[PDB]
Design a binder for this molecule. Structure first.
Ligand SMILES: [K+]
Ligand SMILES: [K+]
Ligand SMILES: [K+]
Ligand SMILES: [K+]
Ligand SMILES: [K+]
Ligand SMILES: [K+]
Ligand SMILES: [K+]
Ligand SMILES: [K+]
Ligand SMILES: [K+]
Ligand SMILES: [K+]
Ligand SMILES: [K+]
Ligand SMILES: [Mg+2]
Ligand SMILES: [Mg+2]
Ligand SMILES: [Mg+2]
Ligand SMILES: [Mg+2]
Ligand SMILES: [Mg+2]
Ligand SMILES: [Mg+2]
Ligand SMILES: [Mg+2]
Ligand SMILES: [Mg+2]
Ligand SMILES: [Mg+2]
Ligand SMILES: [Mg+2]
Ligand SMILES: [Mg+2]
Ligand SMILES: [Mg+2]
Ligand SMILES: [Mg+2]
Ligand SMILES: [Mg+2]
Ligand SMILES: [Mg+2]
Ligand SMILES: [Mg+2]
Ligand SMILES: [Mg+2]
Ligand SMILES: [Mg+2]
Ligand SMILES: [Mg+2]
Ligand SMILES: [Mg+2]
Ligand SMILES: [Mg+2]
Ligand SMILES: [Mg+2]
Ligand SMILES: [Mg+2]
Ligand SMILES: [Mg+2]
Ligand SMILES: [Mg+2]
Ligand SMILES: [Mg+2]
Ligand SMILES: [Mg+2]
Ligand SMILES: [Mg+2]
Ligand SMILES: [Mg+2]
Ligand SMILES: [Mg+2]
Ligand SMILES: [Mg+2]
Ligand SMILES: [Mg+2]
Ligand SMILES: [Mg+2]
Ligand SMILES: [Mg+2]
Ligand SMILES: [Mg+2]
Ligand SMILES: [Mg+2]
Ligand SMILES: [Mg+2]
Ligand SMILES: [Mg+2]
Ligand SMILES: [Mg+2]
Ligand SMILES: [Mg+2]
Ligand SMILES: [Mg+2]
Ligand SMILES: [Mg+2]
Ligand SMILES: [Mg+2]
Ligand SMILES: [Mg+2]
Ligand SMILES: [Mg+2]
Ligand SMILES: [Mg+2]
Ligand SMILES: [Mg+2]
Ligand SMILES: [Mg+2]
Ligand SMILES: [Mg+2]
Ligand SMILES: [Mg+2]
Ligand SMILES: [Mg+2]
Lengths: 64, 74, 97
RNA sequence: UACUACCCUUGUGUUAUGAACCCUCUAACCCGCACCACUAAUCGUGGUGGGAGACAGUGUCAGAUGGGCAGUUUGACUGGGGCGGUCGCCUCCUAAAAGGUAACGGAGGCGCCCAAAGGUUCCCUCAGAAUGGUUGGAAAUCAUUCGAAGAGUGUAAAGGCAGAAGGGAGCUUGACUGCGAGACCUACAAGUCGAGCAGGGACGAAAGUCGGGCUUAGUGAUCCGGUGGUUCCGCAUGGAAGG
RNA sequence: GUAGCGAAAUUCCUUGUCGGGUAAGUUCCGACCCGCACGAAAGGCGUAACGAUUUGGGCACUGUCUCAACGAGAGACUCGGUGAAAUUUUAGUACCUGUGAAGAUGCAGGUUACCCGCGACAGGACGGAAAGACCCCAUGGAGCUUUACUGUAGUUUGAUAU
RNA sequence: AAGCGACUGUUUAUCAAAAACACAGGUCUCUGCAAAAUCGUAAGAUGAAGUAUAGGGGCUGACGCCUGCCCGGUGCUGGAA
RNA sequence: GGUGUAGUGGUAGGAGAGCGUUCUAAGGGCGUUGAAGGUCGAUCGUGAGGACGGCUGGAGCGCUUAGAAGUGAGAAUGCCG
RNA sequence: UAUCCGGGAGUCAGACUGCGAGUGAUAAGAUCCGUAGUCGAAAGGGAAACAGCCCAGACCACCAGCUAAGGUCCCAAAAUA
RNA sequence: GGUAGCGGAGAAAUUCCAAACGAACUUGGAGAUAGCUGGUUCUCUCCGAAAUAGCUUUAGGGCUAGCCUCGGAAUUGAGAA
RNA sequence: CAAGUCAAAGCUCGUUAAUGAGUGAUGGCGUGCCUUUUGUAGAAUGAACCGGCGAGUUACGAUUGCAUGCGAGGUUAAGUCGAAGAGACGGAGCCGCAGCGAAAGCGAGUCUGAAUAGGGCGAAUGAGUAUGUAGUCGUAGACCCGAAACCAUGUGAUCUA
RNA sequence: CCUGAGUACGGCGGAACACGAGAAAUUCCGUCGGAAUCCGCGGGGACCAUCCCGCAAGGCUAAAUACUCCCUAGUGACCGA
């Protein structure tokens, strides 16, 4: 049997050209009155997956 | 009871005298202006000092008993 | 698995969807076509026979990264505007299948 | 105003229909009722009587009840465990003059408030003591002097502030939008600061300040739903559903 | 909370107080009732007979004991025959003091001790037997309870069909 | 002489013989006969080849004197606008 | 291949070099003038280990290169004898 | 020897000694931190014996020498200096 | 002869149901699962740790970072004293 | 005296003949092996002894390194022919060469944004692919043993109720 | 004129379809209700219109595919008590 792809990751990341992963941000759903606007505008900007985290999830989302 | 405390926040100097540094850097975190701003230095909402342009950090006495930070470029 | 700690996938949000009617085109970047003899007719059939394009996914799209140096009667599904400019400037002729 | 019709509300009737409900019927169903036959049979199947009767029973669907039965749950830290207490966040000490640093070590706070307690421009400087003066005292308020902060700073403590961040009066709403080089902290997720650019503004003559408050707490993922907008998609097409 | 009972199969305090029994009685019997925390079919109070029932006292009786002594027989013991088991890292397997995973046959220092056995005892080998049953832990199990959760067989009510 | 249980019986085969169980007796409750209850998918069966002086279930437990107050709560029964 | 300098304690652990066993393909060679195995030797190699002899034994086995693995035991209150 | 990239791990029970503090009874081979060392994972020499103290880091051989801490009357090498 | 395990029988003790019954025995799912203990076999060489932070229905487990090893790479040589 | 080691007298033999073999009085030093532990000589665990047996394997996939072939082209799968073969055929498909964005869509640019702004992700910097091999991971019992237990058939009342 | 009626379909309850009611097409079971038929009917993933494709509710149908108690001929870098 071949690998199973973690679909919860396949719905939550995206491959770049260098193989790295794009990701949405947290603290961006429902509770904004507690957050300044700098946080909100800086969190609507995506970011990239960490080194040690990609080390942990690459086997899951190997090809995707 | 008494058993609790907060995350220690990492105040104090972050750039050293005689040290070239980038613009927008941070030189001295603080609560209250234990050191004032000076040349080419600003101050944030939390009284944190930051160099507006490049240059060497220089700390100076602002007269008798208050301190200053300055950034003289090259 | 992070030991019961909330995993990275779960602490992040799902984003987007997939368009079932998506048109993904096979790309030819204008540095290839320096191969073919000037004046000829480039087609998906030609590109496949040469082996340049093996997967005509939705149609050939032509894009302009490299420098063109020939007259060519190229034809495809879609062209980019810079590719149109470069071809028509070299002296070729754009068509659309 | 008579009279003709078009007629309209209201409530009487005929007829046809639809439901609900009570009684009556027997012909379905039923009888661990009797008799006859199959038959030597307390079975059963039929037949004849009698009884009940469109109920019951059975099927489907639904509501209440249901430890009768079943599958499961029933935190951690901890000078054993348990109770007490604690779990998230902020401040100080411990913390050993960078930073960091533990204990069921010592002390306290937070889960908000403010439409001015913000911004800008202009102006001002406090606490207490002495002296005197009416009710008015130990002490309100008035006046002079002394007065370097011994006050105040929305709210804890620390740091800091009298070139004010403290106080007062005008004009406003920058408690803006898109962003953001670069740094700090950081396992990750996050958090913090941020010059500067652009748009469109506030105040001010102008310089220039303004992306909340004096600085640090006032908060919590994703999933899932809700609201508004959208130039996004829309299972052959147009829409729609739904994203 | 009545009758009735009450330091009780119930009374902690408590060896309660008083009396009897004993030279001496935390037990026992009878009264008192500050009933920690009796009580009326979870029955209360009483009750002849019954009991391999529990408790205390007395008489007789005795080796239970004071304090052991003797005898008999089976085994043990010697010989002949026959012939296991548990256990077992190797072993030429002393003592004191001390040390040391904190309690030493084995390390140290000192002392004592010719070699090999037989019968006896049982202080140690933290002896053997048994992966502690007390304790804690496991995001273990099983049985059981329930106004824990979620369900369900049945029970019941209704609608509909026959 | 005292306690418990009235008694004869039964009981943890292999650590508990008992003051525990049962017992006759008492009381409450249900059940009208295709009973009620129970086994079982249902047929079918026990109950009973019985019929409220019978049967099932709960509690107490010979005999004697007794068995007090509480229906607010939880259940049950009945009722009904 | 040599000279010099410096170094070479080691658990978990990482890396690299190997010895040995069984089998296979090829090459080559040794065995009734006595194979393997067994046993004793005072032998060689840095180690895993490798030869040569003596006795036993009686028919298959080494050596070189490469390959494939049921490839190496001292403990499992391990199993069988 | 630091950094960046990538492969593979193991480790999340630590102990003592000295110095700096807390808890403690300024007691504990106690507990919890910091700091340095050692052990762990380190043999050797001394401390009688003695992981954790003092000296010192085993690649091997030598019937060679100089020293460390600690020691020099005998056990037991060295001065009855 | 009858009652058979989601059970039966039980003068009722968690009691008996073929020498251990809070749910018999046997076969199969089945090599159940085990963050738990025990074990895991030849050699040499190079290098060589940690017992810490954070989070964890987490605390004797795990994940990331920290500490180790191996390969590559480049850089105004940053590293250590 | 964890039973040896080192030194060594004496005695007896004579080798894979070389700083020989065996024994050993006597003296010095020296608390087994494993596991698990901060730490075990351990009075913590396991082993009576001997011999045999007995534990990281394979299949399919992923990734990294090493090697080979080819190279911005590298490669076939199934199936057919054919020694249970190699090999040929088979280009369907797979990876890479172009990415960015939720997507429309644009394209060495794209997205955000009013924006030639700035910023993110990418390109100009470039190399991958097929096979083998080894390390590692995943799915399968996955390293070996070891539970109490759960479920579904069946067998049992010759014991006992 | 005919072209498969208690049928398709719908409601309720459940299943299978990769698809756990979800926006849930399609298929099937139970129950209840309940069509037209050539200008007709079903599908194209709620659904409506257009277009396209097909014509259920009646039946059969070899081959390629799976497996070996067995028989014959055999093969093995499978075992060798
Ligand atoms: K009394
Ligand atoms: K009492
Ligand atoms: K003894
Ligand atoms: K349970
Ligand atoms: K009542
Ligand atoms: K073996
Ligand atoms: K060391
Ligand atoms: K000796
Ligand atoms: K590879
Ligand atoms: K290559
Ligand atoms: K459906
Ligand atoms: Mg949102
Ligand atoms: Mg601020
Ligand atoms: Mg949690
Ligand atoms: Mg009857
Ligand atoms: Mg239950
Ligand atoms: Mg379960
Ligand atoms: Mg606990
Ligand atoms: Mg405690
Ligand atoms: Mg400090
Ligand atoms: Mg459409
Ligand atoms: Mg459609
Ligand atoms: Mg008394
Ligand atoms: Mg009463
Ligand atoms: Mg009572
Ligand atoms: Mg009563
Ligand atoms: Mg009684
Ligand atoms: Mg002891
Ligand atoms: Mg001792
Ligand atoms: Mg010694
Ligand atoms: Mg004898
Ligand atoms: Mg013992
Ligand atoms: Mg145990
Ligand atoms: Mg008494
Ligand atoms: Mg009796
Ligand atoms: Mg009797
Ligand atoms: Mg008994
Ligand atoms: Mg009774
Ligand atoms: Mg080394
Ligand atoms: Mg060395
Ligand atoms: Mg052989
Ligand atoms: Mg093996
Ligand atoms: Mg053995
Ligand atoms: Mg010191
Ligand atoms: Mg300690
Ligand atoms: Mg210390
Ligand atoms: Mg260790
Ligand atoms: Mg040492
Ligand atoms: Mg040791
Ligand atoms: Mg000398
Ligand atoms: Mg001497
Ligand atoms: Mg009991
Ligand atoms: Mg299974
Ligand atoms: Mg000894
Ligand atoms: Mg031992
Ligand atoms: Mg043993
Ligand atoms: Mg269960
Ligand atoms: Mg029988
Ligand atoms: Mg349909
Ligand atoms: Mg239906
Ligand atoms: Mg056999
Ligand atoms: Mg044999």
């Amino acid at each position: 049997p071949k690998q199973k792809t973690h679909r919860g990751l396949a719905k939550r990341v995206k491959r770049t050209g260098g193989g790295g992963l794009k990701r949405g941000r947290a603290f961006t759903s429902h509770r904004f009155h507690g957050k300044t606007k700098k946080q909100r505008r800086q969190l609507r900007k995506a970011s990239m997956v960490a080194k040690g985290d990609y080390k942990r999830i690459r086997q899951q989302l190997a090809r995707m | 009871s008494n058993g609790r405390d907060s995350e220690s926040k990492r105040l104090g100097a972050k750039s050293a005298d005689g040290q070239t540094v980038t613009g927008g850097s941070i030189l001295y975190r603080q609560r209250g202006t234990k050191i004032y701003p000076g040349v080419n230095v600003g101050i944030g909402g939390d009284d944190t000092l930051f160099a507006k342009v490049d240059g060497v950090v220089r700390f100076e006495r602002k007269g008798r008993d208050k301190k200053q930070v300055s950034v003289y470029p090259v | 698995f992070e030991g019961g700690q909330t995993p990275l996938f779960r602490r992040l949000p799902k984003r987007g969807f997939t368009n079932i009617n998506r048109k993904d085109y096979a790309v030819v970047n204008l540095d290839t076509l320096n191969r073919f003899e000037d004046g000829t007719e480039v087609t998906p059939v030609v590109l496949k026979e040469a082996g340049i394009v093996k997967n005509e996914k939705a149609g050939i799209k032509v894009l302009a990264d490299g420098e063109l140096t020939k007259k060519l009667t190229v034809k495809a599904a879609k062209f980019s505007k810079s590719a149109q400019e470069a071809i028509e400037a070299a002296g070729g002729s754009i068509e659309v299948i």
